[PDB]
């Protein structure tokens, strides 16, 4: 019935299995990324934060592909691990061959070609994982890309994948400055959009992970912000929201007087 | 059936295997061919069909190594494949051993090759029945091979569509064989094809092929005007 | 009345016929004169496009769960006939109930009243409403961490 | 749930392997039964022997095989599968002795056979051959050992076990007999095994309708008891019981 | 010889809480010099330098393949490779091709990332790790390097003293080596600094 | 009932038929008609080109192609399978020339192409279904002009005159009526074009047809616009 | 539900489920209780070794098995699959040792075993491993307790229970577990968590427990388990 | 259908593989082949069915020589029987090439049984549709006769019968003192048994194929000579008349 | 029921899944291709992008070699794969024979690749159509079109994608020698053809031009605006 195999065309020309993978990406934890002329950054939510879980790994969704690139994964865990290892292998193969870091677009293209082969060939289900890549290369500087289960990728100034991606991307569209966004404003916007998209009480700092890539002294640095910094950002956002609510209450009181 | 005849790998719940029977049916979609043998000759005679009055008549007698010829009834693709295999086997035998391959051994090779498909799901049984005429130092041989991978050493046989008329004629007249001149032998074969022919039809030089092998006679195929000395001599009904 | 299935051994052809008759009655020959229809459904994505077609269903009203202000309103509505103690904050209860439907709010009021009934009381307090909220909005989240962690 | 039944590799919605369970049903299909018991310093396997024809050579008919010089097995289930698995066990024991220079431990051979069976249970290439292998040997540091190698990769070691149609009855009987002075001698172990079979089958044995293989610490070579020895055991132990 | 084709010369020594890896600078094919800025010491970490020396092709190939393996390892682990782990990695890399080897003799020198204790070792072209406590030498004029290290090494040196010792050893060994030596680069790795120097030399 | 017997090329039906070969032979009909005529003075091929719209230059519909300097192929069926079989024929002719230093006969080249076509599911050749293309190899060899017809089942046979494609059944009857052995090549061309005009829904003029001829002499010649118009003048 | 999309492992159901791996996890949850607690100075693994009869020699087949001098492993699920996975884990640890002359870190061993499970859960002719592994190691200077699922996903745990009554086990561990717990107290907590889901009398020889401290992983002898049971009771 | 009877790799919910049983059904539909192990030899008899007067004498032999000293008597699909005869010939040839002496019949039977079990294991191939018997005689091992069936079981025998009339053949064989008869008389008994079990109104034509391997052949299997077969056939016809009387 | 298998003929003779690949091509944006005396031009609809999205990573016009360009219509990932393989084959044919790839050769290779993927049953057809425009080494403005089935033709002007039929009919009506007499009227014609489907016309148009011996040049958006202004002026004048 046109979805029993990944290599079957619907009579309208649609690969229902690829569409199923694309939709299924919606189960993954909300990851998002913002590009700033000072740097680039990702944020991501921890879907499961049980108190009995340990925190052995410094990051669950954000991986460091090489010196100048990181990526957030959203989708099936096994597929995400496979693709992260393959991304690292691709980057290091390019570095071995050419003696310079793989450009971000080339790395994205390589992994997306792997994904396309999986969608096209034989009895292999498509990779049910979407990816958000951030990086810096000598050609286009800071870059942010997004890649689908179907092996299609695009370059974005700001984007979001996973849960409530529609709301997050609409919010970024509303409140992103196309060419006048710095890293501090990017972090503030990331906290705002995560708070409005997670839809779980207050923005618990332990339920979010943020990473920032920036050039410094001629070398790229990828830092996963410590929980102290994340808590400080959340507290500043909460103070801003409280100030806005106080202003609105004062306006309501003035209207009552009028 | 309906779930026990999809492939050769499934036995039906009766000890019966269905795709082999379907191939044995495919053998009947060919054309009539009668093989027979005296004590010093072997003759295959085939009723060549015609796809149109312009198109020539499809050949039905093929020439395996000099002492062997073949008459085919069934899928022409499988006929070609088996003819190529038989030619290769005869050539290999004549290369290793400087003597012609015995017909009774060539047929065993054909049987093994055709049995292999009838047990594994990778292909279909060879839907072609063969009448193998040969002359080895033992004597003239006529063999029949069926898609089931079974071969019978026949003193005279017939295969193809409308075969029982020729088979009954052969059963009736086989006592005459052995002590027959080559002309009489070919005449008996032609009579068998006449019997299998529809009444209004008749054997013409256009639609009759006659392969003969025997002592001091390497397998020769007579077609078109080559059969005139046989049909002309043949008595009329 | 729901998405039509291909007529076969696994299709409710008779219910499909009933729905077709209803469609014809809503909009066919001899349009209705003064009959207005209020259909109600809990999942709209499955209704037949023929039913959802305008002219048959001219308007479609969504009923989102209350947005904490509708929740305060529902709390007031269902606590009007109740002996609420002073210092009781239905606004706080509304905040404590995120994404809760009007049925959930009515059940909250009912269960707080039941807590009051238990202790031979005719009295409801903030603790009673909070315990009722906890008891009514009880979620059966996933049990197994493996099935929970299949997806990143 | 019957859809999840025609393939060895499909998990039922509750996580069951119906084809493996059916392989066990296949074990319970040869009609025969087998029992095994270990004493202080011996192990004994006894199998019901059916020869339902005068033309069938009872010498060739058997279910006791000598896997190696010091390891024996009793096979119950389909006969072709039993002999295939016996050949596999002999080959594995020979390979072990070749590679490592000492005779294969019984538990090791059981683990090897169980792993071989688990491979078939996981991949979809063969059917899990439906036979149960009970192995007995003498381990230099542990002593007598009896093991099973059921067709799913399970190979627990046993004080006493049974397989075939009446495995449950034999298991209950052996549980009762082992709760009381599990310490058995050679004669007592042969008694227990033969009595278990006789009681579960509801029949008293002729010397021929039973086959016994034995290993002992003093003589750690798998020996198949002859008709005279079987008759001696039956008569003496029935008399002095 | 195969090594004497491209020449080469590398050394490593250690004192107290600091190591010193030094190497000559030259690339001449057999006798003719080609360049004088050939990198024979490659940084595999903050405080871990390898000193491949031998056939130039294999020096570069081993540097690049080792960096490939080490980048994979560090990304996969999240750690920074310890000196012993790097030694084992290079030994495995070299011995994977015993029947036809990489004609280079690695010399690793670094500081343990956690306890910051010195480490130095050298490998042969098939991967026989040799962890020592005083000094390792590789490449041509190994005899000269051994004589210098023997007669000039003293336990428990401080950065500057170790600098002088390794400087003198390398300079005097290369000045007596023919195919190798057109300047000497010395990297001294301490708890918090790397001092890279470009010593004077007999540029002939 | 042909639902458990025509889903694969290696499944016999109770009658002993390969319905997939039947279906490839049916797919032949979807191509445009092509009439080949063998005569003592050579062989002629004439095909209904089926231009769907302008802007597609005519030298992209290859219904008539050249195999060596002494054979032409008139094709009907899938373009892809047509290309595969035409390439096989060309390479086989060149291989035979390379080895034996002579021109492969029309029968032999048709036999080689048929040998390629037989291998539907034979697991040692990789194609998995019959080539849905039927070919007419008209050439000249030491046996005089010859024309051979090959079908998806791999069956080939010579034909004093043949017609493949959509208007095959309705054009072979006309060929039977009009063909006689003692016919000249000009007569064959005229008769073939007459039959094409009979069986075409479009009018016969200049383009929408192709015509080619192989004679005992000059190589395989594809008539250009001038010759096509000259013949069409008084077909 | 999505009935059609539950027999294959190479097709997404319309909602994105991979139903067959969830069925494998159901097979896991329908297994013997096992518990793992990460003490402050060590780790402890326990699992019921209750036999179906007195005849089963409960000293031949072990359920808590070592993989290195500093890593051990228990499971919940099918024993044959467990045997396969423990053999593969030992082989992977040995390969890591040969390449890097250093015992494999627990995190790396878990990664590689999860990769093995992923390899087995990516085709149609292969059945996913119907077990969940609990790996306990003493890499570096701190203890590690990890879980590995048939899906190829691996977790880091403070304490967990898997098997028939994993819900009750996890509630009990939420009640009782405190981070600054010495290994000696963690052993008692493990045995008590087992008792809360262990039918019959928890005799010393039908329960299996393995500790992992700085001295290396070690399966406690039945005498030691008897002593711990007596002290707990 | 059952739903578990497709492919020999599927166990029904009883532990039964039905494809092997269908193969057994296929073999239990053919002519009758019997074999009796006398004291100093083994004699095979087969009631070959001449399915047409056109086939020459000796067509479709069901008695093969599988190695010089071992004879094979087949019953079932003759194509599968020929393939199994080739397999057994190759196994005996490999044994003589490797170990250097004539293959023991017990070992040959085990090898061919393992091959048949190989083909009953998988779903990509169907179980062999024929049973057969392997007989031989040697000074150092003695007369031996084994029977192999589609499921792949290799039990030894004193007298065996496979095909349509197997139960009747075994019944008529039980009434023989085979353990102390000689070949020259057991051949006549084989002919008599075959003629008795043969059905004339159902199978029509008929041809008795006899072979022995025994001391009087120096352990060399061969077809029973013309005169001996003629005398045994005459005795069998006379015995048929006697039993009718 | 004679569907879902790439190698199964239907009783009518149709291989339906390659036809479904074509039906998947039809779901792509219009891509027009025209050839003139000394210019070959490809126009494409952009469909616009969300303002947060970057544009340079959205390519429908890709230069396979110095003298060959390819416009796309279909599945994007298949686009990327086929373009990469075509580039590899261009630069590998250069190695095999010291001559630049001809447009016919490269389009034949792409068609053969698509046919190779349609042949078997463990592969999915490349659901794309391509317009290959280039200059032969002698210099000749060749334009070919390849379909998912592996069949390639040579066209004088064609459009593929959503507006294929309408744009092709318009090109049939309004393609002439006087309309391609020079190197600018061809571009006017391509923008005219695209304006029949693209509503905006200036923000939903990309033109790529190839002149003899000159590298592919993609027209600036301001140049596109100027051209559409010229067409609008001519339209209002000749109304």
Least Cα distance to E123 among E177, E183, E51, E69 occurs for E51
DSSP H or E segment with residue A180:
none
Residues of D with CB under 8 A from a CB of H: 5-6, 8, 18-19, 22-29, 53-57, 59-61, 78-81, 83-84, 87, 125-130
- Asked if the D1-240 domain carries CATH number 3.60.20.10, the reply is yes
The answer to whether the CB of D127 falls within 8 A of the CB of D115 is no
Least Cα distance to B60 among B52, B69, B48 occurs for B48
Residue of chain I minimizing CA distance to A7 = I124
Question: Measured between CB atoms, does A75 come within 8 Å of chain C?
Answer: yes
Return the axis-axis angle of helices B76-96 and F106-118, rounded to nearest 10°.
Answer: 100
Q: Which residues contact I141 (CB under 8 A, 6 or more apart)?
A: I35, I36, I37, I38, I39, I40, I133, I135
DSSP per residue over chain I, as a string?
---S-TT---TTS--HHHHHHHHHHTTS--EEEEE-SSEEEEEE------TTB-STT--SEEEEETTEEEEEEE-HHHHHHHHHHHHHHHHHHHHHSSSPPPHHHHHHHHHHHHHHHHHSSSB----EEEEEEEE-TT--EEEEEE-TTS-EEEBSEEEESTTHHHHHHHHHHT--TGGGSSTTHHHHHHHHHHHTT-SSSSSS-EEEEEETT---EEPPHHHHHHHHHHHHHHHHHH-
* Helix (H/G/I), strand (E/B), else coil: E180: coil
Residue of chain A minimizing CA distance to E74 = A66
Q: In sequence order, what E strands does F111-180 have?
A: 133-141, 144-150, 156-158, 161-164
Question: Measured between CB atoms, does G141 come within 8 Å of chain E?
Answer: no
Contact I77 A11 (CB under 8 A): no
Residue the block writes with tokens 């994205």: A108
Least Cα distance to C71 among C115, C109, C41 occurs for C109
Which residue(s) pair with E204 in the sheet? none
Which residue(s) pair with H209 in the sheet? H46
- Residue H6's domain spans which residues? 1-239
User: How far, in whole angstroms, is CA A181 from its chain's centroid?
Assistant: 18
- Residue F102's domain spans which residues? 6-235
DSSP H or E segment with residue C67:
none
Residues 122 to 151 of A: which have CB under 8 A from any I CB? Answer: 122-123, 145, 150-151
- Residue A179's domain spans which residues? 1-246
> Does the residue H244 lie in any domain?
no
- Cα distances from D228 to residues A200, D188, D225, F5, in angstroms, run 83, 18, 8, 64
Give the Cα separation of D208 and D54 in Å (integer).
13
Give the Cα separation of F222 and A181 in Å (integer).
69
Which chain B residues have a beta carbon less than 8 Å from that of H1? Answer: 3-4, 13
Return the axis-axis angle of helices H167-174 and H183-197, rounded to nearest 10°.
Answer: 140
Residue of chain G minimizing CA distance to E95 = G99
Q: Do G and A count as touching (3 or more CB pairs closer than 8 A)? A: yes
Give the Cα separation of A221 and A213 in Å (integer).
6
- Resolution (Å units): 3.1
The answer to whether the CB of D15 falls within 8 A of the CB of H4 is no
Residues 162 to 191 of E: which have CB under 8 A from any G CB? Answer: none
Superfamily of domain I1-239: Aminohydrolase, N-terminal nucleophile (Ntn) domain (3.60.20.10)
Alpha helices in chain A (DSSP H): 16-24, 77-98, 104-120, 165-174, 183-198, 227-257
Which residue(s) pair with H144 in the sheet? H136
- Cα distances from G41 to residues B81, G182, G183, in angstroms, run 75, 6, 6
Least Cα distance to D217 among D50, D74, D36, D44 occurs for D44
* Helix (H/G/I), strand (E/B), else coil: G56: strand
Q: Which residues contact D90 (CB under 8 A, 6 or more apart)?
A: D67, D68
Question: Measured between CB atoms, does C146 come within 8 Å of chain G?
Answer: yes
No. of H helices and E strands in chain A?
Answer: 6, 10
Contact D22 H15 (CB under 8 A): yes
Q: What is the DSSP-derived secondary structure letter of residue F129?
A: S
Tokens representing residue H44 in the block: 């095979």
Contact E68 A93 (CB under 8 A): yes
Q: Do I and F count as touching (3 or more CB pairs closer than 8 A)? A: yes
Return the axis-axis angle of helices I103-119 and I76-96, rounded to nearest 10°.
Answer: 130
Give the Cα separation of G97 and G92 in Å (integer).
9
Residues of B with CB under 8 A from a CB of H: 3-4, 8-17, 108, 111-112, 115-116, 118-122, 148-150, 152-157, 167, 170-171, 174
Looking at the structure of chain H, the number of domains it has is 1
Contacts 24+ apart (CB under 8 A), G195-201: G195/G232, G196/G165, G196/G168, G196/G169, G196/G172, G197/G33, G197/G48, G197/G161, G197/G163, G197/G164, G197/G165, G197/G168, G197/G169, G198/G33, G198/G48, G198/G50, G199/G50, G200/G50
Work out the burial of residue B115: count CB atoms within 10 Å of its CB; fewer than 13 is exposed, 13-18 middle, 19 or more buried.
buried
Least Cα distance to I83 among I134, I36, I131, I155 occurs for I131
CATH (domain of A79): 3.60.20.10
Torsion of CA A147, A152, A153, A159, to 10 degrees: -60
> Does the residue F217 lie in any domain?
yes
| Three-class HEC string of H95-130 | HHHHCCCCCCHHHHHHHHHHHHHHHHHCCCECCCCE
Q: In sequence order, what E strands does G105-219 have?
A: 131-137, 144-148, 154-156, 159-162, 207-213, 216-219
Q: Which residues contact B157 (CB under 8 A, 6 or more apart)?
A: B34, B35, B36, B131, B142, B144, B167, B170, H54
| Three-class HEC string of chain B | CCCCCCCCCCCCCCCCCHHHHHHHHHHHHCCCEEEEECCCEEEEEEECCECCCCECECCCEEECCCCEEEEEEECHHHHHHHHHHHHHHHHHHHHHCCCCCCHHHHHHHHHHHHHHHHCEECECCCCEEEEEEEECCCCEEEEEECCCCCEEEECEEEECCCCHHHHHHHHHHHHHCCCCCHHHHHHHHHHHHHHHCCCCCCCCCCCEEEEEEECCEEEEEECHHHHHHHHCCCCCC
Give the Cα separation of H112 and A207 in Å (integer).
66
Residue of chain H minimizing CA distance to D128 = H9
The answer to whether the CB of I115 falls within 8 A of the CB of I149 is yes
Least Cα distance to E72 among A86, G101, A108, G96 occurs for A86
* Helix (H/G/I), strand (E/B), else coil: A63: strand
Q: Which residues contact G94 (CB under 8 A, 6 or more apart)?
A: none
Mutate to test the interface with B, among F12, F14, F118 (most CBs of B within 10 A): F12
Q: Which residues contact I29 (CB under 8 A, 6 or more apart)?
A: I44, I45, I46, I47, I60, I73, I161, I162
- Residue G22's domain spans which residues? 3-232
> Does the residue A61 lie in any domain?
yes
Closest Cα in chain B, distance from residue F52 (Å): 32
Least Cα distance to H152 among H32, H27, H52 occurs for H27
- Cα distances from H117 to residues D84, H91, H110, in angstroms, run 8, 15, 10
Least Cα distance to D123 among D1, D10, D12, D4 occurs for D10
Give the Cα separation of A162 and A76 in Å (integer).
11
Q: Do I and E count as touching (3 or more CB pairs closer than 8 A)? A: no
Q: Which residues contact A137 (CB under 8 A, 6 or more apart)?
A: A68, A101, A103, A104, A105, A143
* Domains of chain E as residue ranges with CATH: 1-204 (3.60.20.10)
Question: Measured between CB atoms, does E31 come within 8 Å of chain A?
Answer: no
Domains of chain B, residue spans: 2-235
Q: What is the DSSP-derived secondary structure letter of residue D4?
A: G
Least Cα distance to B36 among B215, B188, B139 occurs for B188
Half-sphere exposure of I45 (CA within 13 A, CB side): 24
Q: What is the DSSP-derived secondary structure letter of residue D123?
A: B
Mutate to test the interface with B, among F2, F3, F6, F16 (most CBs of B within 10 A): F16
Looking at the structure of chain F, the number of domains it has is 1
The answer to whether the CB of A161 falls within 8 A of the CB of A106 is no
Give the Cα separation of I126 and I129 in Å (integer).
9
Residue of chain G minimizing CA distance to D170 = G55
| Chain I neighbours, 3+ Cβ pairs < 8 A | A, F
Least Cα distance to F46 among F144, F142, F171 occurs for F171
Which residue(s) pair with D44 in the sheet? D37, D214
Q: What is the CB neighbour count within 10 angstroms for residue E37?
A: 11
Closest Cα in chain D, distance from residue G13 (Å): 15
Q: What is the CB neighbour count within 10 angstroms for residue A16?
A: 20
User: How far, in whole angstroms, is CA C26 from its chain's centroid?
Assistant: 26
Least Cα distance to F63 among F42, F41, F78 occurs for F78
The answer to whether the CB of H41 falls within 8 A of the CB of H185 is no
Backbone angles phi, psi at C136, to 5 degrees: -85, -40
Give the Cα separation of E55 and E104 in Å (integer).
6
Residue of chain B minimizing CA distance to H125 = B120
Q: Do H and A count as touching (3 or more CB pairs closer than 8 A)? A: no
The answer to whether the CB of B3 falls within 8 A of the CB of H1 is yes
Q: Which of D83, D127, D129 sits opposite H10 (nearest CB)?
A: D127
The answer to whether the CB of H89 falls within 8 A of the CB of H70 is no
Q: What is the CB neighbour count within 10 angstroms for residue D139?
A: 16
Q: So what's the architecture of B2-235 in CATH? A: 4-Layer Sandwich (3.60)
DSSP H or E segment with residue D189:
helix D186-201
Q: What angle do CA C122, C126, C128 make, to 5 degrees?
A: 55
């Amino acid at each position: 019935r046109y979805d029993s195999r990944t290599t079957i065309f619907s009579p309208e020309g649609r690969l229902y299995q690829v569409e199923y993978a694309m939709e299924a990406i919606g189960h993954a934890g909300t990851c998002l990324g913002i590009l700033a002329n000072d740097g680039v950054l990702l944020a991501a939510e921890r879907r499961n934060i049980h108190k009995l879980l340990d925190e052995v790994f410094f990051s669950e969704k954000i991986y460091k592909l090489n010196e100048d690139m990181a990526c957030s994964v959203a989708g099936i865990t096994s597929d995400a691990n496979v693709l992260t290892n393959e991304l690292r292998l691709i980057a290091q193969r390019y570095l071995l061959q050419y003696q310079e870091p793989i450009p971000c677009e080339q790395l994205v293209t390589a992994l997306c070609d792997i994904k396309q082969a999986y969608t096209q060939f034989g009895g292999k289900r498509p990779f049910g994982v979407s990816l958000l890549y951030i990086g810096w290369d000598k050609h286009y500087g800071f870059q942010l890309y997004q890649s689908d289960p179907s092996g299609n990728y695009g370059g974005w100034k700001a984007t979001c994948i996973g849960n409530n991606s529609a709301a997050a991307v609409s919010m970024l569209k509303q409140d992103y400055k196309e060419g006048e966004m710095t890293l501090k404003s990017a972090l503030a916007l990331a906290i705002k959009v995560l708070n409005k998209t997670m839809d779980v009480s207050k923005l618990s700092a332990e339920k979010v992970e943020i990473a920032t890539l920036t050039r410094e002294n001629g070398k790229t640095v990828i830092r996963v912000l410590k929980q102290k910094e994340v808590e400080q950002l959340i507290k500043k956002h909460e103070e801003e929201e409280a100030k806005a609510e106080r202003e609105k209450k004062e306006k309501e009181q003035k209207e009552k007087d009028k | 059936r309906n779930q026990y005849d999809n492939d050769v790998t499934v036995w039906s719940p009766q000890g019966r295997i269905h795709q082999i029977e379907y191939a044995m049916e495919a053998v009947k979609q060919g054309s009539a061919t009668v093989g027979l043998k005296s004590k010093t000759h072997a003759v295959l005679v085939a009723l060549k069909r015609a796809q149109s009055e312009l198109a020539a008549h499809q050949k039905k007698i093929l020439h395996v190594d000099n002492h062997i010829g073949i008459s085919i009834a069934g899928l022409t693709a499988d006929a070609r494949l088996l003819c190529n295999f038989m030619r290769q086997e005869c050539l290999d035998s004549r290369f290793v051993f400087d003597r012609p391959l015995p017909v009774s051994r060539l047929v065993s090779l054909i049987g093994s090759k055709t049995q292999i498909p009838t047990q594994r799901y990778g292909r279909r049984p060879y839907g072609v029945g063969l009448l193998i005429a040969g002359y080895d130092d033992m004597g003239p041989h006529i063999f029949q091979t069926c898609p089931s991978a079974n071969y019978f050493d026949c003193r005279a046989m017939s295969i193809g569509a409308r075969s029982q008329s020729a088979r009954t004629y052969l059963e009736r007249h086989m006592s005459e064989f052995m002590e027959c001149n080559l002309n009489e032998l070919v005449k008996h074969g032609l009579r068998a094809l006449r019997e299998t022919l529809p009444a209004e039809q008749d054997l013409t030089t256009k639609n009759v092929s006659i392969g003969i092998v025997g002592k001091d006679l390497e397998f020769t195929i007579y077609d078109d005007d080559d059969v005139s000395p046989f049909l002309e001599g043949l008595e009329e009904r | 009345g729901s998405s039509r299935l291909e007529g076969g051994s696994g299709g409710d052809s008779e219910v499909q016929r009933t729905m077709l008759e209803l469609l014809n009655q809503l909009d066919g020959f001899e349009a209705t004169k003064n009959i207005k229809v209020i259909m109600a459904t809990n999942r709209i994505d499955i209704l037949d496009s023929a039913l959802l077609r305008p002219g048959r269903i001219d308007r479609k009203i969504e009923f989102p769960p209350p947005n904490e202000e509708a929740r305060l309103d529902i709390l007031k509505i269902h606590s009007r006939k109740m002996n609420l103690t002073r210092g009781i904050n239905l606004r706080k209860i509304a905040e404590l109930m995120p994404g809760a439907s009007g049925a959930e709010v009515k059940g909250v009021c009912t269960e707080a009243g039941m807590y009051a009934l238990r202790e031979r009381r005719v009295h409801v307090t903030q603790e009673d409403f909070e315990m009722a909220v906890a008891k009514v909005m009880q979620k059966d989240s996933e049990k197994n961490m493996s099935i929970k962690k299949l997806w990143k | 749930s019957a859809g999840f039944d025609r393939h060895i590799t499909i998990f039922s919605p509750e996580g069951r392997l119906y084809q493996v369970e059916y392989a066990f049903k296949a074990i319970n299909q040869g009609g025969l039964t087998s029992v095994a018991v270990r004493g202080k310093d011996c192990a004994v396997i006894v199998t019901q022997k059916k020869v339902p024809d005068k033309l069938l050579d009872s010498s060739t008919v058997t279910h006791l095989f000598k896997i190696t010089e010091n390891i024996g097995c009793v096979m119950t289930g389909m006969t072709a599968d039993s002999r295939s698995q016996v050949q596999r066990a002999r080959y594995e024991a020979a390979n072990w002795k070749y590679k490592y220079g000492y005779e294969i431990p019984v538990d090791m051979l059981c683990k090897r056979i169980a792993d071989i069976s688990q491979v078939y249970t996981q991949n979809a290439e063969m059917r899990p051959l439906g036979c149960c292998m009970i192995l007995i040997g003498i381990d230099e540091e542990q002593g007598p050992q009896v093991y099973k190698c059921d067709p799913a990769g399970y190979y627990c070691g046993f004080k006493a076990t049974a397989a075939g149609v009446k495995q449950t009855e034999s298991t209950s009987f052996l549980e009762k007999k082992v709760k009381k002075k599990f310490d058995w001698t050679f004669e007592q172990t042969v008694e227990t095994a033969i009595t278990c079979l006789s009681t579960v089958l509801s029949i008293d044995f002729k010397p021929s309708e039973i086959e016994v293989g034995v290993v002992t610490v003093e003589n750690p070579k798998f020996r198949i008891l002859t008709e005279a020895e079987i008759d001696a055991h039956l008569v003496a132990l029935a008399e002095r019981d | 010889s195969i090594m004497s084709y491209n020449g080469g010369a590398v050394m490593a020594m250690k004192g107290k809480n600091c190591v010193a890896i030094a190497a000559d600078r030259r690339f001449g094919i057999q006798a003719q010099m080609v360049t004088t800025d050939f990198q024979k010491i490659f940084p595999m970490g903050d405080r871990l330098y390898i000193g491949l020396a031998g056939l130039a092709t294999d020096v570069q190939t081993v540097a690049q393949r080792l960096k490939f393996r080490l980048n994979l390892y560090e990304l996969k682990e999240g750690r920074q490779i310890k000196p012993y782990t790097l030694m084992s990695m290079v030994a495995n890399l070299l011995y994977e091709k015993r029947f036809g080897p990489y004609y280079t003799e690695p010399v690793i020198a670094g500081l343990d990332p956690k306890t910051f204790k010195p480490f130095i070792c050298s490998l042969d072209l098939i991967g026989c790790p040799m962890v020592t406590d005083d000094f390792v030498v590789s490449g041509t004029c190994a005899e000269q390097m051994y004589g210098m290290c023997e007669s000039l090494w003293e336990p428990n040196m401080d950065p500057d003293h170790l600098f002088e010792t390794i400087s003198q050893a390398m300079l005097n060994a290369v000045d007596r080596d023919a195919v190798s030596g057109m300047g000497v680069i010395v990297h001294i790795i301490e708890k918090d600094k790397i001092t890279t120097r470009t010593l004077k030399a007999r540029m002939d | 009932t042909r639902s458990e017997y025509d889903r694969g090329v290696n499944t016999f039906s109770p009658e002993g038929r390969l319905f997939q070969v039947e279906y490839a032979i049916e797919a032949i009909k979807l191509g445009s008609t092509a009439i080949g005529i063998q005569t003592s003075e050579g062989v002629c091929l004439a095909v209904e080109k089926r231009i769907t719209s302008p802007l597609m230059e005519p030298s992209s519909i290859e219904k008539i192609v050249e195999i060596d300097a002494h054979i032409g192929c008139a094709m009907s069926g899938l373009i892809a399978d047509a290309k595969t079989l035409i390439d096989k024929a060309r390479v086989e002719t060149q291989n035979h020339w390379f080895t034996y230093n002579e021109t492969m006969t029309v029968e032999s080249v048709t036999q080689a192409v048929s040998n390629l076509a037989l291998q539907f599911g034979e697991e040692d050749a990789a194609m998995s279904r019959p080539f849905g293309v039927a070919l007419l190899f008209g050439g000249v060899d030491e046996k005089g002009p010859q024309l051979f017809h090959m079908d998806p089942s791999g069956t080939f046979v010579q034909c004093d005159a043949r017609a493949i494609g959509s208007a095959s059944e309705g054009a072979q009857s006309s060929l039977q009526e009009v063909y006689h052995k003692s016919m000249t090549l000009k007569e064959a061309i005229k008769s073939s074009l007459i039959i094409l005009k009979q069986v075409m829904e479009e009018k016969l003029n200049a383009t929408n047809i192709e015509l080619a001829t192989v004679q005992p002499g000059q190589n395989f010649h594809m008539f250009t616009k001038e010759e096509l118009e000259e013949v069409i003048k008084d077909i | 539900a999505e009935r059609g999309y539950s027999f294959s492992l190479t097709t997404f159901s319309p909602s994105g489920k991979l139903v067959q791996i969830e069925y494998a996890l159901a097979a896991v949850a329908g297994g013997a209780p096992s518990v793992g607690i990460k003490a402050a100075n060590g780790v402890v693994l326990a699992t019921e070794k209750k036999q179906k009869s007195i005849l089963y020699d409960e000293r031949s087949v072990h359920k808590v098995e070592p993989i290195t001098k500093h890593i051990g492993l228990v499971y919940s699920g099918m024993g044959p699959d467990y045997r396969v996975l423990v053999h593969r884990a030992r082989k992977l640890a040995q390969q890591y040792y040969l390449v890097y002359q250093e015992p494999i870190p627990t995190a790396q061993l878990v990664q590689r075993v999860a990769s093995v499970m992923q390899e087995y859960t990516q085709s149609g002719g292969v059945r996913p491993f119907g077990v969940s592994l609990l790996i306990c190691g003493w890499n570096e200077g701190r203890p590690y307790l990890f879980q590995s699922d048939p899906s190829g996903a691996y977790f880091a745990w403070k304490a967990t229970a898997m098997g028939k009554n994993y819900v009750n086990g996890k509630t009990f561990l939420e009640k009782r577990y405190n981070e600054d717990l010495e290994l000696e107290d963690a052993i008692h907590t493990a045995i008590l968590t087992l008792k809360e889901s262990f039918e019959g009398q928890m005799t010393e020889d039908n329960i299996e427990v393995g500790i992992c401290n700085e001295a290396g992983f070690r399966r406690l002898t039945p005498t030691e388990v008897k002593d711990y049971l007596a002290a707990i009771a | 259908g059952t739903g578990y009877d497709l492919s020999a790799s599927t166990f029904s919910p009883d532990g039964r593989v039905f494809q092997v049983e269908y193969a057994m059904k296929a073999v239990e539909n053919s002519s009758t082949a019997i074999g009796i192990r006398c004291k100093d030899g083994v004699v095979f008899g087969v009631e070959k069915l001449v399915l047409s007067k056109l086939y020459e004498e000796g067509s479709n032999k069901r008695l093969f020589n599988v190695d010089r000293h071992v004879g094979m008597a087949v019953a079932g699909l003759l194509a599968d029987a020929r393939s199994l005869a080739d397999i057994a010939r190759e196994e005996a040839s490999n044994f003589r090439s490797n170990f250097g002496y004539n293959i023991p019949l017990k070992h040959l039977a085990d090898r061919v049984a393992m091959y048949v079990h190989a083909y009953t294991l998988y779903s990509a191939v169907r179980p062999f549709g024929c049973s057969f018997m392997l007989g031989s005689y040697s000074v150092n091992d003695g007369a031996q006769l084994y029977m192999i069936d589609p499921s792949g079981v290799s039990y030894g025998y004193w007298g065996c019968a496979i095909g349509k009339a197997r139960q009747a053949a075994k019944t008529e064989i039980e009434k023989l003192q085979m353990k102390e008869m000689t070949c020259r008389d057991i051949v006549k008994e084989v002919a008599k048994i075959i003629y008795i079990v043969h059905d004339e109104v159902k199978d029509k034509a008929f041809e008795l194929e006899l072979s022995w391997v025994g001391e009087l052949t120096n352990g060399r299997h061969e077809i029973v000579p013309k005169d001996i077969r003629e005398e045994a056939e005459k005795y069998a016809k006379e015995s048929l008349k006697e039993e009718d009387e | 029921s004679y569907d879902r298998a790439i190698t199964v003929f239907s009783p009518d003779g149709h291989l339906f899944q390659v036809e479904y690949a074509q039906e998947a091509v039809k779901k792509g944006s219009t891509a027009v291709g025209v050839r003139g005396r000394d210019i070959v031009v490809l126009g494409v609809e952009k469909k616009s992008v969300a303002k947060l999205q970057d544009e340079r990573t959205v390519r429908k016009i890709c230069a396979l070699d110095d003298n060959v360009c390819m416009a796309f219509a279909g599945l994007t990932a298949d686009a990327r794969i086929v373009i990469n393989r075509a580039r590899v084959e261009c630069q590998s044919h250069r190695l095999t024979v010291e001559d630049p790839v001809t447009v016919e050769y490269i389009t034949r290779y792409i068609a053969s690749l698509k046919q190779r993927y349609t042949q078997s049953n463990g592969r999915r057809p490349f659901g794309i159509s391509a317009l290959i425009v280039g200059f032969d080494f002698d210099g000749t403005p060749r334009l070919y079109q390849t379909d998912p089935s592996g069949t390639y033709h040579a066209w004088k002007a064609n459009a593929i994608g959503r507006g294929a039929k309408s744009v092709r009919e318009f090109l049939e009506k309004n393609y002439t020698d006087e309309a391609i007499e020079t190197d600018d009227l061809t571009i006017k014609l391509v923008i005219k053809a695209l304006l029949e489907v693209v509503q905006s016309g200036g923000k939903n148009i990309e033109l790529a031009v190839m002149r003899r011996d000159q590298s592919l040049k993609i027209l600036n958006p301001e140049e596109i605006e100027k051209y559409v202004a010229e067409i609008e002026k001519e339209k209002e004048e000749n109304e």
